[PDB]
mmCIF file of C-alpha atoms and ligand atoms in Angstrom:
data_model
loop_
_atom_site.group_PDB
_atom_site.id
_atom_site.type_symbol
_atom_site.label_atom_id
_atom_site.label_comp_id
_atom_site.label_asym_id
_atom_site.label_seq_id
_atom_site.Cartn_x
_atom_site.Cartn_y
_atom_site.Cartn_z
ATOM 1 C CA UNK C 6 -191.072 130.749 -125.617
ATOM 2 C CA UNK C 7 -187.598 130.135 -127.950
ATOM 3 C CA UNK C 8 -186.966 128.303 -130.988
ATOM 4 C CA UNK C 9 -186.760 123.779 -130.778
ATOM 5 C CA UNK C 10 -184.131 122.853 -128.273
ATOM 6 C CA UNK C 11 -183.212 126.406 -126.853
ATOM 7 C CA UNK C 12 -182.730 127.299 -122.738
ATOM 8 C CA UNK C 13 -181.874 129.762 -120.714
ATOM 9 C CA UNK C 14 -178.740 129.299 -118.725
ATOM 10 C CA UNK C 15 -176.149 130.830 -116.234
ATOM 11 C CA UNK C 16 -172.984 131.218 -116.912
ATOM 12 C CA UNK C 17 -170.942 130.390 -114.007
ATOM 13 C CA UNK C 18 -167.628 132.148 -114.340
ATOM 14 C CA UNK C 19 -169.947 135.406 -115.419
ATOM 15 C CA UNK C 20 -173.610 135.317 -113.477
ATOM 16 C CA UNK C 21 -174.628 136.604 -117.167
ATOM 17 C CA UNK C 22 -177.457 134.704 -118.261
ATOM 18 C CA UNK C 23 -176.624 132.486 -122.095
ATOM 19 C CA UNK C 24 -179.259 130.239 -123.974
ATOM 20 C CA UNK C 25 -178.238 126.757 -124.644
ATOM 21 C CA UNK C 26 -179.455 123.782 -126.995
ATOM 22 C CA UNK C 27 -179.132 120.620 -126.186
ATOM 23 C CA UNK C 28 -179.942 118.637 -129.452
ATOM 24 C CA UNK C 29 -176.940 120.922 -131.144
ATOM 25 C CA UNK C 30 -175.130 122.066 -128.401
ATOM 26 C CA UNK C 31 -175.141 124.906 -128.905
ATOM 27 C CA UNK C 32 -174.287 127.815 -126.804
ATOM 28 C CA UNK C 33 -174.144 130.829 -126.970
ATOM 29 C CA UNK C 34 -174.612 135.106 -125.246
ATOM 30 C CA UNK C 35 -177.789 136.311 -127.459
ATOM 31 C CA UNK C 36 -181.447 135.131 -127.876
ATOM 32 C CA UNK C 37 -181.754 132.684 -130.197
ATOM 33 C CA UNK C 38 -185.005 134.023 -132.306
ATOM 34 C CA UNK C 39 -187.840 132.239 -134.054
ATOM 35 C CA UNK C 51 -189.160 122.439 -141.487
ATOM 36 C CA UNK C 52 -187.289 122.033 -144.676
ATOM 37 C CA UNK C 53 -187.486 118.626 -146.656
ATOM 38 C CA UNK C 54 -183.777 119.003 -146.374
ATOM 39 C CA UNK C 55 -180.419 120.791 -144.917
ATOM 40 C CA UNK C 56 -176.861 120.866 -146.153
ATOM 41 C CA UNK C 57 -174.297 120.662 -143.529
ATOM 42 C CA UNK C 58 -171.184 119.934 -143.340
ATOM 43 C CA UNK C 59 -168.691 118.540 -140.357
ATOM 44 C CA UNK C 60 -165.511 118.136 -139.048
ATOM 45 C CA UNK C 61 -166.147 114.763 -137.540
ATOM 46 C CA UNK C 62 -163.142 113.904 -134.665
ATOM 47 C CA UNK C 63 -162.925 109.540 -133.710
ATOM 48 C CA UNK C 64 -161.919 108.621 -131.042
ATOM 49 C CA UNK C 65 -161.193 104.783 -130.054
ATOM 50 C CA UNK C 66 -164.085 103.711 -129.499
ATOM 51 C CA UNK C 67 -165.619 104.961 -133.044
ATOM 52 C CA UNK C 68 -167.291 102.571 -135.062
ATOM 53 C CA UNK C 69 -164.631 102.983 -137.387
ATOM 54 C CA UNK C 70 -161.610 103.265 -135.572
ATOM 55 C CA UNK C 71 -159.248 104.789 -138.526
ATOM 56 C CA UNK C 72 -159.476 108.002 -140.533
ATOM 57 C CA UNK C 73 -157.140 109.362 -143.632
ATOM 58 C CA UNK C 74 -156.192 110.986 -140.943
ATOM 59 C CA UNK C 75 -154.436 107.578 -139.339
ATOM 60 C CA UNK C 76 -154.386 104.243 -139.755
ATOM 61 C CA UNK C 77 -155.829 103.387 -136.050
ATOM 62 C CA UNK C 78 -156.922 105.875 -134.114
ATOM 63 C CA UNK C 79 -156.328 105.229 -130.475
ATOM 64 C CA UNK C 80 -157.577 108.930 -128.590
ATOM 65 C CA UNK C 81 -159.679 108.280 -126.086
ATOM 66 C CA UNK C 82 -163.184 110.095 -126.449
ATOM 67 C CA UNK C 83 -161.782 112.242 -123.848
ATOM 68 C CA UNK C 84 -159.075 113.417 -125.836
ATOM 69 C CA UNK C 85 -161.648 113.773 -128.677
ATOM 70 C CA UNK C 86 -164.038 116.192 -127.305
ATOM 71 C CA UNK C 87 -160.819 118.279 -125.646
ATOM 72 C CA UNK C 88 -160.037 118.691 -129.696
ATOM 73 C CA UNK C 89 -163.143 119.314 -130.476
ATOM 74 C CA UNK C 90 -164.009 122.020 -128.096
ATOM 75 C CA UNK C 91 -160.395 123.961 -129.015
ATOM 76 C CA UNK C 92 -161.472 123.436 -133.021
ATOM 77 C CA UNK C 93 -164.969 125.382 -131.434
ATOM 78 C CA UNK C 94 -162.873 127.881 -130.221
ATOM 79 C CA UNK C 95 -160.285 129.025 -132.755
ATOM 80 C CA UNK C 96 -163.798 128.949 -135.648
ATOM 81 C CA UNK C 97 -165.455 131.128 -132.768
ATOM 82 C CA UNK C 98 -162.710 133.562 -132.304
ATOM 83 C CA UNK C 99 -162.110 134.002 -136.373
ATOM 84 C CA UNK C 100 -158.579 132.415 -135.779
ATOM 85 C CA UNK C 101 -158.824 129.417 -137.668
ATOM 86 C CA UNK C 102 -162.334 128.927 -140.690
ATOM 87 C CA UNK C 103 -164.364 125.927 -140.105
ATOM 88 C CA UNK C 104 -163.985 125.051 -143.448
ATOM 89 C CA UNK C 105 -159.783 125.242 -143.182
ATOM 90 C CA UNK C 106 -160.029 123.015 -139.357
ATOM 91 C CA UNK C 107 -162.518 120.620 -141.171
ATOM 92 C CA UNK C 108 -159.858 119.992 -144.801
ATOM 93 C CA UNK C 109 -157.276 119.667 -141.974
ATOM 94 C CA UNK C 110 -158.182 117.342 -138.931
ATOM 95 C CA UNK C 111 -161.334 116.116 -139.321
ATOM 96 C CA UNK C 112 -161.312 111.846 -139.885
ATOM 97 C CA UNK C 113 -164.257 111.837 -142.259
ATOM 98 C CA UNK C 114 -163.414 111.505 -145.896
ATOM 99 C CA UNK C 115 -165.428 114.946 -146.115
ATOM 100 C CA UNK C 116 -162.921 116.331 -144.923
ATOM 101 C CA UNK C 117 -160.994 116.893 -148.665
ATOM 102 C CA UNK C 118 -164.546 118.607 -149.463
ATOM 103 C CA UNK C 119 -163.587 121.215 -146.401
ATOM 104 C CA UNK C 120 -165.819 118.724 -144.100
ATOM 105 C CA UNK C 121 -169.290 119.093 -147.360
ATOM 106 C CA UNK C 122 -171.734 116.119 -146.698
ATOM 107 C CA UNK C 123 -174.234 118.143 -149.008
ATOM 108 C CA UNK C 124 -177.846 117.870 -149.195
ATOM 109 C CA UNK C 125 -179.405 115.093 -147.080
ATOM 110 C CA UNK C 126 -183.035 114.802 -145.720
ATOM 111 C CA UNK C 127 -183.913 113.114 -142.160
ATOM 112 C CA UNK C 128 -183.597 109.023 -141.678
ATOM 113 C CA UNK C 129 -180.081 109.206 -143.432
ATOM 114 C CA UNK C 130 -177.620 110.287 -141.204
ATOM 115 C CA UNK C 131 -177.386 109.108 -138.019
ATOM 116 C CA UNK C 132 -179.751 110.160 -135.708
ATOM 117 C CA UNK C 133 -177.822 112.954 -133.661
ATOM 118 C CA UNK C 134 -176.094 114.843 -136.560
ATOM 119 C CA UNK C 135 -179.102 114.417 -138.117
ATOM 120 C CA UNK C 136 -181.540 116.506 -135.015
ATOM 121 C CA UNK C 137 -178.558 118.587 -134.509
ATOM 122 C CA UNK C 138 -178.371 119.286 -138.321
ATOM 123 C CA UNK C 139 -181.965 120.272 -139.204
ATOM 124 C CA UNK C 140 -182.557 122.114 -135.174
ATOM 125 C CA UNK C 141 -178.846 124.328 -136.659
ATOM 126 C CA UNK C 142 -180.614 127.798 -138.426
ATOM 127 C CA UNK C 143 -179.013 128.440 -141.962
ATOM 128 C CA UNK C 144 -175.140 129.189 -141.338
ATOM 129 C CA UNK C 145 -175.482 128.273 -137.306
ATOM 130 C CA UNK C 146 -172.471 125.917 -136.051
ATOM 131 C CA UNK C 147 -173.109 123.128 -133.768
ATOM 132 C CA UNK C 148 -171.658 122.191 -130.398
ATOM 133 C CA UNK C 149 -170.007 119.190 -130.161
ATOM 134 C CA UNK C 150 -172.603 116.476 -131.057
ATOM 135 C CA UNK C 151 -171.890 112.478 -130.544
ATOM 136 C CA UNK C 152 -172.703 109.557 -132.986
ATOM 137 C CA UNK C 153 -170.827 106.298 -132.951
ATOM 138 C CA UNK C 154 -168.619 108.072 -135.653
ATOM 139 C CA UNK C 155 -167.230 109.852 -133.155
ATOM 140 C CA UNK C 156 -167.357 114.067 -132.057
ATOM 141 C CA UNK C 157 -169.332 116.616 -134.243
ATOM 142 C CA UNK C 158 -168.828 120.208 -135.215
ATOM 143 C CA UNK C 159 -171.320 121.093 -137.468
ATOM 144 C CA UNK C 160 -172.345 123.943 -139.651
ATOM 145 C CA UNK C 161 -175.582 123.846 -141.457
ATOM 146 C CA UNK C 162 -174.876 125.610 -145.169
ATOM 147 C CA UNK C 163 -178.125 125.218 -145.956
HETATM 148 C C1 LIG N 1 -169.052 110.722 -146.087
HETATM 149 C C2 LIG N 1 -168.635 111.508 -147.631
HETATM 150 O O1 LIG N 1 -169.347 111.590 -147.715
HETATM 151 N N1 LIG N 1 -167.650 112.620 -147.803
HETATM 152 C C3 LIG N 1 -167.154 113.278 -148.337
HETATM 153 C C4 LIG N 1 -167.822 114.401 -148.799
HETATM 154 C C5 LIG N 1 -168.107 114.635 -150.321
HETATM 155 N N2 LIG N 1 -168.782 115.997 -150.065
HETATM 156 C C6 LIG N 1 -166.831 114.711 -150.891
HETATM 157 C C7 LIG N 1 -166.021 113.354 -151.050
HETATM 158 C C8 LIG N 1 -165.776 112.593 -150.205
HETATM 159 C C9 LIG N 1 -165.338 111.214 -150.117
HETATM 160 C C1 LIG N 2 -172.638 111.861 -140.525
HETATM 161 C C2 LIG N 2 -173.442 110.739 -140.407
HETATM 162 O O1 LIG N 2 -174.001 110.313 -139.333
HETATM 163 N N1 LIG N 2 -172.863 109.512 -141.228
HETATM 164 C C3 LIG N 2 -173.321 108.274 -141.306
HETATM 165 C C4 LIG N 2 -174.759 107.996 -141.327
HETATM 166 C C5 LIG N 2 -174.986 106.122 -141.084
HETATM 167 N N2 LIG N 2 -176.600 106.523 -141.256
HETATM 168 C C6 LIG N 2 -174.344 105.475 -140.739
HETATM 169 C C7 LIG N 2 -172.679 105.718 -140.652
HETATM 170 C C8 LIG N 2 -172.445 107.380 -141.090
HETATM 171 C C9 LIG N 2 -170.906 107.410 -140.472
HETATM 172 CL CL1 CL N 3 -164.348 106.050 -145.368
#
């Protein structure tokens, strides 16, 4: 009885219930409450050797494995969630997308325009919410819905 895409889950380590969104891969302790023509998102992309274009402004030849990319994504999420780092700072420094130079901002878009998993996560996020790891042919994304 939860917003689109949410399910109850059980923490293995602590035994406490949490909520998981299978569209955004977000997870959180707190019970979520609750479609625009357009949303605005920022993202942090980590590419891997199987990315559509395994090359970025950071690295002419991206050689990391998808597993390694996911560990990096997980570490960025941890630091954003802890407040040790800001999303925008990590995107500027470490996103393999050319949008890193705009602190990850992709601007506004509607359905049909972005890769489908990215699109679906974006529209399932509430304004201000952040995804978990989202997989596309580009690689692995942390998505921040800003509008
Ligand atoms: C992939 C993409 O959209 N990149 C980008 C986004 C913004 N906002 C500014 C400049 C660039 C190059
Ligand atoms: C963020 C995103 O999904 N970008 C994108 C969208 C399409 N349609 C094709 C290729 C890329 C890289
Ligand atoms: Cl590009």
